[PDB]
Structures are given as C-alpha cells and as structure tokens.
Design a binder for this molecule. Structure first.
Ligand SMILES: [Zn+2]
Lengths: 148, 204, 60, 113, 128, 80, 99
RNA sequence: AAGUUGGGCACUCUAAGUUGACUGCCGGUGACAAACCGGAGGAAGGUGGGGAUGACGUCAAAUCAUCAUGCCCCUUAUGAUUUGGGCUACACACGUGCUACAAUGGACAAUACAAAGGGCAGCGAAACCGCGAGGUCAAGCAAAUCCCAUAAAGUUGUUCUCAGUUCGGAUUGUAGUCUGCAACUCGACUACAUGAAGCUGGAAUCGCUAGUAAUCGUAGAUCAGCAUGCUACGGUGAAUACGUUC
RNA sequence: AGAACCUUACCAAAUCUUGACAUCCUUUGACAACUCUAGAGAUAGAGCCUUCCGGACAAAGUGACAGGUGGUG
C-alpha cells in the first residue's frame, strides 16, 4: 500500500567544519528542537577529543564513524527467516550516528560533551559500545550468511 | 449526516434573511426579529407565507413577506396589512413598514410544497401519492430537479420509516447550485411526521 | 427547559450574584452565548436558516 | 554546628543553613547578609567570628524545636476544638478541601488494594 | 546611492533587504548580524546566495526585518538577498534558481483541527 | 469577608439574636442555619444548634473556637 | 480640517458599493476625498458541538466577519455635509461620522 | 528618548478588483488514445498544502433532560417558593491529562525575535505604596490609534558537581491579596516555613510521513471569581519510509 | 463553553393549592420604587402613596385550566 519512494532531505554543511555528517550528528543529538544546545554540546565534544588525542577532530570522528558503520544487516523475509542483506550508504551513516549517540548517552561520564567525546574516542580506537553493536550485527549476519 | 443545504450555501450564493448590523444590542435585535417572525408565522398560517426578510435602519423595521397568496395578507381594502402593521408596532416600539412579494409559482417553492404535503398528511392522504404528485407538478413547471422525503409513522405502523422520491438533478454537493430546501411537520394522530423537500430550479 | 425554571430565571433575584443566563429561545442553561443569548443548538439552527446576520459556516 | 544542628561541612554556607529546620533559601540569604559572610564560602572554610555572627543572627529566628512545638500546638488546638480541619487531621485525609475519590495518597499513605 | 531593494518572506517573517556597494557587512535592525542571529549557521545561510552568485563581499546588506523568530527572519533575509541580487543582475537568475534560493518556501504552520490535540496529533486511543 | 479591610462576616440576624439576652446568665440555645457566620468572642460560652443539612447539631462555643466558621463544627457528610 | 467616515458591514460587496457611493457624493459636492482605506477585517469564530447530546469530538465552526472602510474628507463644505447627511445607505452597512 | 512630528506613499502592510497552475509547452513511452516518466519556464506541477462538503444503507446506535410530539400517569402533588446539604463522599479498579524523577539540568545576572484574539460601563497605561498576590489616584480607548501585553523556549556569563541533592513541589502551619453578600463543606493567587512519593516505569498499549512529531510560550468562549480542559496563534524544530511477504 | 448561593433535577426542614408560568370570564384603580417588626428565607403584619392612556396596563375570587428535567429514543 505505497505508491513509491519519497525525496530525501539534504542538510547544510557544518558552519565551521563544513561536514554534512557533522550537521546530521547535530540533528541526532538535538532534543525538543534545542539546536543551540546540540551545537554547543557537539563542539565542546570535538574540542575535548582534539585536546585528548592531538589529532584533527574531523579525522578522528571520520575514523570513528567508519569503525561503527555496518555493512550487513539481518532483515526478515518469507517459511520466515532472517536473511543477511547489504546496507545502503545512507543507512550506514544513519546507523553510525544513531548508535554513536545512543551509546554515548549511556556512558558514565557526567556531561553529554564528555560522554560524546569519550564515545567517539573509543569508536576511533575500535573498542566502543557502538563498535560492539556493529560487531554483533556483523556476526549474526555471518551466522545467517547461508540464507543469503 | 447530510448538511442542511441552506446552511451550507448561506453566504456563498444565498443571502441572509436578516439584513442589518449591530455591535451592542445584537442579541436584543436578533430576538426582536425572532419574536416578530414567530408572530407573523402564527398569524398568517392560512396564507402561503413562503418566507420573511427583516432589515432595520434609521430606527425603522422593513419587513418583506414573500408569499404565494398576497391577496390574503393584504386584504381587499388593505385592512389585513394595516392590522398586521399595527400589531407589529404594538409589539415592537419601533416603526414597521411591510411589503408583500408575490411568488408566481408556489409549486416551485420548497417551503410551500412542504407545508402542502404536511397538510395533506394531516388530512390523512396517501404519503406516496402526495409526494408523487408534488414532484410531478414541480418537474412539469420547469424545475431541473426535485427530491421529496417523508419520515415517521407513515401509515400509522408501529415501526417508523422514511421514504423518498427524486427526479432530475439535485446536486447537493455543488456549491454553485441554488438549491431551495424546506422541512415541515405534520401532527398526525400517531405523532410527528417529518417532510423534507429539495428543489433545484437550475443555474441562475 | 422547565417553565417554572425559566420564569424564575426571568424574575428578579433578591441578591445580584444569583443571576444566570438561559437561552431565550428554548431555555437551555448551558452553552449560552452572550452575543446572541442563544444556546449552541438554537444558534446552529438559526445560522442554518440564515437568520443571524453575518454568521456563516467558517473554513480556513 | 549552628542552632544545635550540624550543617553539611562541604556545602556552601547558605545551602547548609537551609538544612536547619525553619530555614529556607530566602531566610538563609537574609541571615547570611545580616551577618556579613560571603555566600560562596563553605562552612568548613569559615572564620570563627563569622560563625559566631551567624549564630547570633540565627538564634532570634525561632527555628528548630521551638518552631516544631509551635506547629504541633497549632495542630493540637485545631484537633481539640473539633474543627473540620481537626477531624481531617485525625482521620489522615486531606485538610484543605481536596478530592478524596482519587489522588489523596500523600495523606492516605500507600495504596491499600 | 545605487541601492538594490528586495523583499523576502519565510514563515511569518518579512525582511526588506537593501544591497549597496560595500565590503560584505550585514546590518539587521541597526545591529550586527552575528549579534542578531544566535548561530553562525544562520549567517552562512544568509551568505549562501552570495556564494552561489560568486559575489561574496561585494555588497553590504541593510535589513529591516520583522515577524517570526530568528531562523525565520534569517531565511527571509536570505530570500530578500537572492531577490535583490536578481534585481541587480538578471544573469544570476540561472545560478540562483539552480541553487533553489529564489523559491519562497510555502511551508506554514498548519491549523489545528477540532477534535485533535494538534494539527495531526490525535488523542490517545483505547479499545475498551 | 476574608480581606482584612472588610470586617469579619457574620449574619446580622444571628448577631442580634446572640446579643439579645446578653445580660441574663440563663443563655439559651440558638437555632441557626448560618454555617457561614464567623465566630466572634461574643459567642464564647453559647450553644448554637447549627443546621448540617437534615438536623441541627449542637455546638458549644469556647475561647479556642474563635476565628472559625460555625460550619467547621457541624459536619455535613456521613462516612462509616 | 478633516471629516472621518467609518463604515462597517458584514459584506465586502455592500461595504464597497456604499463607500463608492459616498465618495462619488463627496466628489460631486466638490470636496476632495482620500480613500477608501480598507481597514483590517475583524473575524470572530464560534465553535459549536454539532450533536445535541454527547459526541464531543464532532464540531462545527461558524464565523462573523465585519469589514471596515475609512473615508477622509479634506475640504469640507456645507453642501458636502448636507449631501453626506442626506444620503441613505443600505441597511446592512453601519456608518459613523466624526467631524 | 521614541515614526516623536514636519514631510513622503518608495518599501512593508491592509483589501477590493484582477493576473496566476490548466497537464498549458517540449521530449520519450503508450494501442493514432487515456494516461505515465523527464525537462523548460514559474512563487507554486501534476486534485500545489489545509479546511468545509459525508452517497444508498448498517448498528431498533445516542438524545422524550435542548426543542417538538402519539400514548400512559400525578393534579392540596410526580406541580411550586425558600434556607441548608449534596452534585467536591473514599478501603478501592479503569480512562484522559498536568508536573517530575535531573547536568541537553537547577539557581542567579544581562540581553533578542511572533502570530492570532478581546475591551463598555468594559480593557485599564504612567506614577507612588508592599518582598509579592495586590492597593491609591488616574491617562488613553466603542479600536490598524489606548489597553490586555514585557512572550517563553532562546543567546552570553557566574555558580552548583552526580544525590533523594541547590532535583521535585505534593502535604501541612502561620501571615495576607482579590472577586463575590458570603470562599467551613467548597475559589484563585502571594509571602515565610515544612519538604512526601518519584532514580525513566511488568504484561500490555497509543500517536505521528514536515513546518509534521517533540518542545516553548501566547489569546478566546463559558465567567462576579475560578482551567492541568476545550478551541485558536505563532517560536525552535527533528528521525525515517528499503519496500508490501506478514 | 465555568456546581460556594443561582445554575440544581437529588436530599432535610420551613412552606402554596386556578398555583412559579399562559389565555379567557367577573370586578376595582393606581401595581407600588421606598421604608419598619418577626422570620434562615420564602412569607406575613404595620406604614404608606406616590404612577394610569373609550382605554390602556395591574391586582381580588372562582372555573375552563396550568404545570411535570415524570415513563416509553
Ligand atoms: Zn436554545
């Protein structure tokens, strides 16, 4: 019961970094429309990761998203079995940012800027909660690899 | 379930029956008009009073009575009109000027047809024959469409029902269409019988 | 409404706070508008009949 | 320890004063300003003379046991006169004309199904 | 003088925008843009038509804007700037249209429907 | 009324009835429906049969009952 | 030295024709008129429960819209004043004159 | 001081009349079609977004308590006038909401930007009095003019620093303000003081496809007084739609 | 789409029986805005006293009658 696919929205680049991914991360972090709170939180987290890593904030964030972006997922089809299926590039970015923020919000730090900075650092090191989520997704996709 | 066509069309292709303006005594003027209309209806039952328009300006009340029997309302010596004017002036402190508008074809007027069919039902005529002849004469007099309906305890039966007959076009969803609608009630020995009539005389 | 109740509303009240509005056409005490002194039901009926100047079905 | 009740050592002086019964933020601020002491300064890092001035200001505010006894006397008076408020205090129901058909837990205790 | 006037609209915000030969400074209601607008994203959105037309810093902007909030006024100013650039040079029409900056965003706040909590949000449903 | 600038409310008839027989020490019971009347110091030691809806509950006025309404000592609802 | 005429009516058609009539009368009488100036329309909305009993979720929305027109007479003359005071407008429109 | 007034009607704006989008035009498809996909221009492209408008009928669905009415019943009473009570009860179960459980936060300081409405004996500025609810006198206004009425979220700083707390503000005591004749049963609001549960909620279950959800305030009807309800207004403003097997 | 009185039907007590409310029939003219006493009030008792066009409008008695948010959606 659906005529087709709808056009997708296009966000503007980050004002300072000029990165659509940064803009989309700001949108993910934003709650109740508090765009300013989202922006300040993200910039503080970027500054903290820059300070703690001595490497470009954009470079480390790109590494983190590359680490926490999945390639395969398990989508049920039917007599009914979950089948591994490649993930679209936009689903990759969506899932990477979504998992990043979701598992940042669960960290034990006091402030969201600290939580996000630590999470992006751990993801860049390939040892974060979002990384664990991606690993579980990939292994279960492999487990169901036969049904592909 | 169906919007009253008059209510749907008022302010689009149909004008208000009360033409005046107020800011402070709106309620007083409205209820004055209501009591005037009630008095006119109670006093001119025998006459084929299609409807009444009320305007007010310069502390005067202009009443326009659209009727199908202007002779009865005016009187041969103009006595009935004068008596009505005097009674209205007694009821309302303001001064009332009454005009009477003749309706040439009373059979194309929704209210007049509704009252006629209700009167026949009270006289215990056939609720089917009455509607059939009404629609026949309305259609022969050039109406583009007409619909009649009667509901209640039709033949005195315990179970009340409704029945309707149509002919021509009655496009109730067309806002352009100047559709006249009327409802009347017959007080039969069994109770209230509701008659509804829609008439569409065409584009104008 | 009850005829005695309408008569009591119409009659003068010894106190002044004891005054309440009723629809002057039917007598309904609830949902009576001040501008027309009519209840919602009578207001709708008269608006459909077109006897309330300037009151027409709205849409926007 | 001011007014016979110990106050949090870590907390700032005004917030620690609020811990005294009968002291609320407005009156803690009034006491602290009357006895010229900085709000920022913690009670632990507080001069002995400053503490003495604070005690001198506080002693006259009718707090702690005196306030508790006064409130209890008022409640007992309204209970004894057999007032409506007294009956509702005795029955443990809302006193200020709330509705008891629902939402009266703060007076009726936990739900007794 | 050499003023290029234009009007921009967005939500309930109307901005009369004047372009003059200048160094790129933007003054809104006799105030600096970076103080009027809480975020630099809004400033970049304002500059976007200038970037598209490739005339960045060649005009000073004077804004008389009222209505809406800060984002609405920022995008109304952007629309006014695009229209003013059109007025200055018709040759920028293709670039602005391709960028999609000449369009007056028709999105408005939908009315509330009776029987609903909001325009779309409906009361919580409960079978039984 | 409640506002201080207005004096404490009390029914004029009730006040005059209480004032009557003030000198005599054989004060009697005063039947009253005025649950709204305030209790003045003049009422101390008096007996008011206050209507609670169906019957007049007797209430004896003491010093501690000053400032309350006569209805506060005539409950209207019955529970258990 | 100006005269204000405020017209209010439920129908923009009748208000416009009345405004045109009064402007024409003033111009014939000789005075100079600036206008008509259409002031913002005032719309009052009424929401009624459609059903007679229960059925809260079904409503009907009526409105009353009064349109407002303003006329300024700049160079008054006794002839202009007499013509304005003698001119009869339709019963619908309400006219207020401020000299 | 101030569009404050002299001056103007350019711009915005208000609102009458008009232009505007119709599959109009060009490509491929397609049965010489109907239509679909794309492109141009255009503010808008494919009924543009939203509203009103609800077929024949179904549920003997709701309403004799809006009103009207067949039949039945009472007529010194099932009618009627008045003071008080009740409709606000409270071992409990269910629905719908408001406020929260905190750091995307609490407090304090300074500083921006709306829309839509209402006002006659009604809306009530300025000033002065109080910490405040409010009070004293009193300006403007039957409204694009005066007032309700400074929007809040927001931005920029200081502070707190992960706990039943500087969270939360229920309950209770005292002292008041207002409306009303009168706030006990049974109004709202203010000040001081107290400071309950509550650490994101089992089974289950609901709404929403864009200026939407979520979040922030603003206005109106009823109304002497009383809103977390209803109906409207705008500010910030998302995520996602592979697709139709279930 | 606004339950302290009214709203308000439900209840207790105090109360009326052409009646709170409509017309008609008999007869009178002020019918009363004001005051005072008992009343919780409705009410009653003293004042008073002023208003009114063939003829207005308003009251005293009785009956046709009124009344019912009583039942049957
Ligand atoms: Zn009514």
């Amino acid at each position: 019961p659906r005529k087709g696919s709808v056009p997708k929205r296009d966000v503007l680049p980050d004002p300072i970094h000029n990165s659509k991914l940064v803009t989309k991360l700001i949108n993910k972090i934003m709650l109740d429309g508090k765009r300013g709170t989202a922006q300040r939180i993200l910039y503080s987290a970027f500054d903290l990761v820059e300070q703690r890593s001595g490497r470009d904030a954009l470079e480390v964030f790109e590494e983190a998203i590359n680490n926490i972006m999945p390639v395969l997922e398990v989508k049920a089809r039917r007599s009914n079995y979950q089948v591994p299926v490649e993930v679209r590039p936009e689903r990759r970015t969506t899932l990477g940012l979504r998992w990043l923020v979701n598992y940042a919000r669960l960290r034990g730090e006091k402030t969201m800027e600290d939580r996000l900075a630590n999470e992006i650092l751990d993801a860049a090191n390939n040892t974060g909660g979002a990384v664990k989520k991606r690993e579980d997704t990939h292994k279960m996709a492999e487990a169901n690899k036969a049904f592909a | 379930q169906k919007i009253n066509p008059i209510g749907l069309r008022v302010g689009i292709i149909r004008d208000w029956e009360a033409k005046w303006y107020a800011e402070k005594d709106f309620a007083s003027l409205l209820h004055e008009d209501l009591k005037i209309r009630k008095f006119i209806d109670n006093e001119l039952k025998e006459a084929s009073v299609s409807h009444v328009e009320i305007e007010r300006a310069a502390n005067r009340i202009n009443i326009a009575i659209h009727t199908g029997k202007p002779g009865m309302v005016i009187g041969k010596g103009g006595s009935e009109i004068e008596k009505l004017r005097n009674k209205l002036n007694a009821l309302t402190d303001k001064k009332v000027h009454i005009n009477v508008i003749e309706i040439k074809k009373v059979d194309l007027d929704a209210r007049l047809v509704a009252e006629n069919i209700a009167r026949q039902l009270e006289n215990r005529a056939s609720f089917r024959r009455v509607q059939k002849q009404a629609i026949t004469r309305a259609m022969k007099l050039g109406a583009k469409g007409i619909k009649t309906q009667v509901s209640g305890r039709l033949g005195g039966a315990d179970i009340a029902r409704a029945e309707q007959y149509s002919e021509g076009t009655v496009p109730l969803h067309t806002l352009r269409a100047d559709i006249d609608y009327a409802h009347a009630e017959a007080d039969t020995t069994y109770g209230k019988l509701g008659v509804k009539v829609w008439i569409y005389r065409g584009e104008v | 409404a009850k005829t005695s109740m309408v008569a009591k509303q119409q009659k003068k009240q010894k106190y002044a706070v004891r005054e309440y509005t009723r629809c002057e056409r039917c007598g309904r005490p609830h949902s009576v508008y001040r501008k027309f002194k009519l209840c919602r039901i009578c207001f709708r009926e008269l608006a459909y009949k077109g006897q309330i100047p300037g009151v027409r079905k709205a849409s926007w | 320890r001011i007014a016979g009740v110990d106050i949090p050592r870590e907390k700032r002086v005004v917030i620690s004063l609020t811990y005294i019964y009968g002291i609320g933020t407005s009156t803690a601020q009034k006491i602290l300003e009357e006895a010229n002491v900085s709000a920022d300064t913690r009670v632990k890092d507080l001069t002995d003379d400053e503490l003495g001035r604070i005690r001198e200001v506080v002693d006259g505010y009718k707090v702690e046991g005196d306030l508790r006894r006064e409130t209890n006397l008022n409640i007992k008076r309204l209970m004894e006169i057999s007032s409506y408020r007294g009956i509702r205090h005795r029955r443990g129901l809302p006193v200020r004309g709330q509705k008891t058909k629902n939402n009266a837990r703060t007076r009726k205790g936990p739900v007794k199904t | 003088q050499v003023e290029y006037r234009g009007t921009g609209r967005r939500k309930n915000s109307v901005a009369r925008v004047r372009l003059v030969p200048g160094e790129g400074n933007i003054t809104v209601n006799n105030r600096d843009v970076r103080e009027y607008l809480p975020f630099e994203s809004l400033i970049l959105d304002l500059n976007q038509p200038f970037d598209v037309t490739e005339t960045k810093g060649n005009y000073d902007v004077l804004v008389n804007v009222h209505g809406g909030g800060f984002t609405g006024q920022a995008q109304a100013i952007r629309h006014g700037i695009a229209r003013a650039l059109l007025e200055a040079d018709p040759e920028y029409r293709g670039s602005l249209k391709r960028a999609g900056l000449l369009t007056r965003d028709p999105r408005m706040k939908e009315r509330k429907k009776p029987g609903l909590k909001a325009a779309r949000r409906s009361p919580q449903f409960s079978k039984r | 009324a409640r506002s201080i600038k207005k004096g404490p409310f009390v029914d004029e008839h009730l006040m005059k009835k209480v004032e009557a027989q003030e000198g005599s020490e054989k004060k009697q019971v005063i039947k009253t429906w005025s649950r709204r009347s305030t209790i003045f110091p003049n009422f101390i030691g008096h007996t008011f049969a206050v209507y609670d809806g169906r019957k007049h509950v007797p209430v004896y006025v003491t010093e501690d009952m000053v400032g309350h309404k006569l209805g506060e000592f005539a409950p209207t609802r019955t529970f258990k | 030295q100006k005269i204000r005429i405020r017209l209010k009516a439920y129908d923009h058609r009748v208000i416009d024709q009345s405004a045109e009539k009064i402007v024409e009368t003033a111009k014939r009488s000789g005075a100079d008129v600036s206008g008509p100036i259409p002031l913002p329309t005032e719309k009052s909305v009424y929401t009624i429960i459609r059903a007679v009993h229960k059925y809260k979720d079904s409503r009907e929305q009526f409105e009353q819209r009064t349109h407002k027109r303003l006329i300024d007479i700049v160079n008054p003359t006794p002839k202009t004043v007499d013509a304005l005071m003698g001119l009869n407008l339709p019963s619908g429109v309400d006219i207020e004159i401020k000299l």
